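Reply to thread "Modeling small-molecule complexes from scratch"

Following up on the discussion above, here's a worked example others can learn from. I took a protein sequence and the SMILES for zinc ion and predicted the complex. Inputs first:
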Amino acid sequence: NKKTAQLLHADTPRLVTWDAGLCTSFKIVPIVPAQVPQDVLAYTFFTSSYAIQSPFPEAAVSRIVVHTRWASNVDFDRDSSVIMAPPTENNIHLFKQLLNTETLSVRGANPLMFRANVLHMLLEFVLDNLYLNRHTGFSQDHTPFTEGANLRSLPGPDAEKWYSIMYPTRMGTPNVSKICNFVASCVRNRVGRFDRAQMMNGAMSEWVDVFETSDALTVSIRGRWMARLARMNINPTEIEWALTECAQGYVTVTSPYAPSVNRLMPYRISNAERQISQIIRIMNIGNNATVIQPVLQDISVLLQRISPLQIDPTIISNTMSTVSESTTQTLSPASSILGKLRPFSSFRVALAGWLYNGVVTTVIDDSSYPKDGGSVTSLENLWDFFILALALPLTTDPCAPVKAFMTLANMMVGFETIPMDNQIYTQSRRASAFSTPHTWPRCFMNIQLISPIDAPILRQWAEIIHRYWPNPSQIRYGAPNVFGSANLFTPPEVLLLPIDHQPANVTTPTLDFTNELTNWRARVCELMKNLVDNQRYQPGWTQSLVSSMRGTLDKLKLIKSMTPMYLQQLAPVELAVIAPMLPFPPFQVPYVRLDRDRVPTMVGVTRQSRDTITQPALSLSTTNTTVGVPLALDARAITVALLSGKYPPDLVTNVWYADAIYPMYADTEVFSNLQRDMITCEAVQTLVTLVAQISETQYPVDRYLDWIPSLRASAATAATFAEWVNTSMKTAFDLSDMLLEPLLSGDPRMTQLAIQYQQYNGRTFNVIPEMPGSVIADCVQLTAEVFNHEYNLFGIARGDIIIGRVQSTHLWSPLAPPPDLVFDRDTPGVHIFGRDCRISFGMNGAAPMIRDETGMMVPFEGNWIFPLALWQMNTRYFNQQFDAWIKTGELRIRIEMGAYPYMLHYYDPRQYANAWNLTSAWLEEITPTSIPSVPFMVPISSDHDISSAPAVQYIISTEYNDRSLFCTNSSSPQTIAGPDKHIPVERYNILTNPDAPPTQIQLPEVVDLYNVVTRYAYETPPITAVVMGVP
Amino acid sequence: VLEVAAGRKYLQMENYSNDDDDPPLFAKDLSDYAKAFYSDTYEVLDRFFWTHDSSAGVLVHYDKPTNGHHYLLGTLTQMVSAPPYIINATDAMLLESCLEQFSANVRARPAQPVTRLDQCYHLRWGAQYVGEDSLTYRLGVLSLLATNGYQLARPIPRQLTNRWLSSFVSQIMSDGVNETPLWPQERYVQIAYDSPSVVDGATQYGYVRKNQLR
Amino acid sequence: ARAAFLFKTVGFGGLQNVPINDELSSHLLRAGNSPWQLTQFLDWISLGRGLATSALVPTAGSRYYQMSCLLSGTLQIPFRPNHRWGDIRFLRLVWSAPTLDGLVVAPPQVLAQPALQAQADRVYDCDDYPFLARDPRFKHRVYQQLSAVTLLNLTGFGPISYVRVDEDMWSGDVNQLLMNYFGHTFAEIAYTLCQASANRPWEHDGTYARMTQIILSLFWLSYVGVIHQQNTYRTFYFQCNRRGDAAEVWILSCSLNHSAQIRPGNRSLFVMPTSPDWNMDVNLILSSTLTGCLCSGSQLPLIDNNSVPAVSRNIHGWTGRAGNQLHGFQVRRMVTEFCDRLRRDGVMTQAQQNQIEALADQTQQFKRDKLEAWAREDDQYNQANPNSTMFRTKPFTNAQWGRGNTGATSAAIAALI
Amino acid sequence: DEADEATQKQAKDTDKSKAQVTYSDTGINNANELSRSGNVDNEGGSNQKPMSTRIAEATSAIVSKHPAYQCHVCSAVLFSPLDLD
Ligand SMILES: [Zn+2]
């Protein structure tokens, strides 16, 4: 029922979202305050002393930090932000949010889970940035800071602040401060509005390009997001046409003809995308009847409301009140038939079923066949036969014919006998049992086996079934230029019907018996009449009962029912006109008549593959899960319908339908659904692309985070991962129902989608859908590619570390140590340690020794190499045996980590500072399950001669990792002692290099913090607003 | 496009009894055995079947379309007259025509004109529903051969009978392989370089003569 | 009304194999797994609203090329005379199914055996492969792309485009539809047409088929300066506020001021940029792409063998014996042809021209330094990795940078009116 | 809204509750029609925040401070000799 609902109405994703704020995800923060006031530079020198608002922080130290939408001002929160804290505070909690359920320590995180975590992080980094950049408004500059440019205005109070973070080229440059120097060297003319598309005098600009702070990365992301939606856009006329085409003319809508104001209306998706979701759709329903039934009932009603046909039983009773008979008689053909008919639901449903015979097969309920089988000697049973014969042909059950046959055969037992196939499916076996092809009796296909002498009636009944059973046909429906096509096994726009449809040429109906189903009634009666006048059956009834029986049969034959007519002329249309509006589009499989060789015997879907099979087409046949269930209808009712149809007195089809359908075409639920399908597919691909980063798949794919460690992943860790990817998606698109759940069954490492059905003769038909692209996926892999460079900005350090004592007064950054201090596996006289490593205690003064990897035993001194794991698996023992030598001795170890989170501790260079206490804790808190952020002790850069003092260090990195650093003493004229770093020009290329195009970015090696951003202002009106109907 | 219902070709009399010596009626004696789709240009008929079921098989007479360019769509009715087989309208139509040409190929006299040069119906659309082992397929081969001029080593009676057809079909379905160099293609009709037929010279569309097919 | 469906694969730039390797393919299939990258291309390219660039794909024209190589390679598998589809690989890739719906990593037993030895400059006929010949729709959707490919592979230059003028095309429905595009950029429009085309392939003289043709002319007739706000084609014309800039943005707009009188008749010709700087001009590319969609259902005029390289002559549906010639042009020079023309009509001042030309110079300078530099990077790689040789961008020669015919074709277009 | 206002006044002018002549809900689909509104400025921007307010905020970031009868002509009839002259 959770599934049931999702079929009728699935939560529609929130696609369009706007951001009026800044398009950036990185912010510059102050770490160590400025040295003001000081003993050398008089305070009257610094800009900050005059309350001048600066573009960057005025402080001794400043670093970049990741913080999605820190400047954004949106309409809808995608609640998927990624917020980091300054490197001087612990960030560990961001890299342990996933598989560290077993991680005890709060300050610690498990390294083998790093990649998994980082990955998911990037996924959210994208999700949280999926907005359209909205255009606000400007104001010309009333000052001379800029040459009368147009400065964009952010909304919200407390805005004056932004105008200075927004445009750096606007600041004045009186100082020789590191900041002013930068500013001063920038091109003047690239600020404010750059270009615009003004179409209507006195309306908004359609869009504007403008210079202003932002980051090339998130700008690109949003760029492709808009690109993807821009493709889904359709215009009023296209919709007019589409809708008009679906309604088959009965309804007429209108679009305007004149200059518009640009509207973004994303709804057009590829057929591929529709098929893929129609499979997912089918998947979670197969075999469970109670899920598909409510769907049929819905359509059942929809029909009742639109169809001009009305069932009025009194018709049968009237004609029957004129049947001639005697009162001294024991039986009454007239009466009995009425009491058997007990004069709808089942009728309307049976029709609906025609649209989904792919997964649902309607059948006549067992309860409708005679308990014992019946006997041609029972008037009661003769009517029972009648009822069934008239109903069967309306079911989708491909075995109906054989049942219609056997139904009589069962009653004829002993009277007329035929050669059955074997001893199990005997002439007396309940007709309702011949439910599969393998059961169709020989004599049913080769009529000649039935003796025209020993079994005249039975034979004739067969000849009829053969020559008069309805011939399937088809009718075209829908409008794929806009809605694409959900058809899988049939051609687009094709709707199969188990009946012959001959469109009507008039609008003012009149009773007509020239119908397929009308003959069927006729034949059936004529047969009965013959069974009665049969020279060896007629002697058992009073000469009077016969006359009555005949009379009755004639009245049934010549009854004035409209149903048969309606079924041939209108019904098919009604269906075709509804089809396009259904939430769950039709899913059919060819209706074959008596060509059993082509009867459908199986339909299945796959969503995983096997062993080493990588091609869908090969694993399909052996990895599909069969689908489908039977639904039983009441033969009684159905017949009464076919017997008492009636049209309104003065009916005029062309008008009637014009009224009945109009309202149905004012329900834009259709369009909404498209957007869902759109996502359902983005979700799928996003899964495979990410999953393929922590595990080995069958899909070709990028790979950039291979340096970040990750555990050997089992089908379990895989699923758990998937589950998060899932959640986050739903959360960001405001979905509350299912998505990916259908695919999540067990192991996702080999997901694939395909469906197939098979005939009796064994021929099979496959359908592998073409995976369309994915913007979400591409964007993740993009930011991943950038992560591979700007990793420090994300609080992650690359390489290894070297725990060793290093005391001196020098001021280098431990995150950018000096070469001669680092060593590696290929350095001379270095000892690597492996698995067989053990320790042999010292004795009688001798030294203790640990075992090499080649089996050499060395003393606790020199340069060793330990893979992190090795220490983790022995924390206590090692800390106990080595710590003492690391601290005051001559031992230096290089722990191999690959990637790790880091935390900084700044200190005053003029005062003694020993980092042992810090690193002691680290080492001691290492576990076979966790490690805390690596701590670094770095000096505070200064802008003036300062005395010097010793500093004892223990941890340094293996390669540069100080890229997080933005600037030192930003407000002073120069940094004299400590790490010196001037504002990173590379990041402001558009401003610092005059020969560069405004639209140039430098990804994925460098993220520019100032680019050209395109802001739109397109309208997003509701369809009913521009496409109007004509009542 | 104009959909025109194919009328009965043979009207069964009362004496009929599916007797060995009764004539085959190739299902063309029943209600609707095929639907015809006329238009004045193939490009259109083709595009018409983009959105229309064709599982049953679509036949075409590229020679002298009995009433204008048109495609024939078979229905799902069948011929039981010739046991122990059960033929589908499509297969039937193929069969009857195929034999009709195999016949004409023998009574071929240079100065004596015939209604159509190639009497074989060629399967244009819906071949993906027919397997390399189905009658519908082998009939395509036979049809091709007949068009290209092959002659049956067997004698074909002036008047056909069920027993005969039954026999023929029986041969068509026996073990063995296609010894000739001709294979069915929806694409168009193949005419061997050194074939007697001259249709390609009498029609503007439908046939193609392969130079390296001898 | 096209009846012959042939396409031409790309040729090696003097390499021993198709100029693409695993590293590059994996990058294309990164988010999508299908080789028919139209959709996935239109996303990356990003409405050509700024210079698009990557590590492995430096320019749009690069991804366009690469996309071509991948198809030229993989497609040689199912097009082998035997028509087997999943028995051999092409660099670890194999087809997902007979219906060419996607590529995936090869099964171990297939990775074990050797790969297919692709060849250069091959010409194939779709109808030779069953699965393509039996499902027309499938064929038409895909051909749309194979064409865009062919239109890039016929010559060593840029993507060919088809410009036609004919008042008879303008019908009711066309007029009705066109008006909706008022205000959208060339890209924004093309993007939709492409999608609408893929869903329901166009007919011969269809509503879309025509309008799309009309759009193309409107673009070009404006790109050259024959039409503008003061001399429109039935009030329509494309506008560009920053002609010359690295990333141009053209807007379809209106103007009642004047509507140039057009000569009755049907006229058409082929154009193509010859300067390498096309790899960085989204419009020039999409323009081809669209003429690409045109080919699925319509048969364009043949291209005179003498205008194309030997290898690609007498290609039943494309190049012929006495066809129309290709009109090439340098991007930079055209810019001037554009200005000169407007200035002659009196709508642009000399000062304005100077201001534009100036920029247009700076732009070329940039685009070239880069292209040449990336070009070098490539060779540098090819010498170090002889087993995975490739090309991130279609090869060009110092000569390509000259004018040559630019002016000649500048007037050829102006003659369509 | 302006359309409604009009058609509604049309009613009051003809002393009827429903207007016979209407400027709204005509057969025509005037879905693209635009009217001048005080929502947009002269630069195609949104007046969500008044031009003056923007200009203010914009300059407020650039500020700095000190450091620590009968007429035979026309035949009209008159009544005063003076009224004549
Ligand atoms: Zn007077």
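What I'd highlight from this example: DSSP finds four helices and nine strands in chain B. Helices of chain B lie at 42-48, 89-104, 135-148, 162-172. Questions welcome below.
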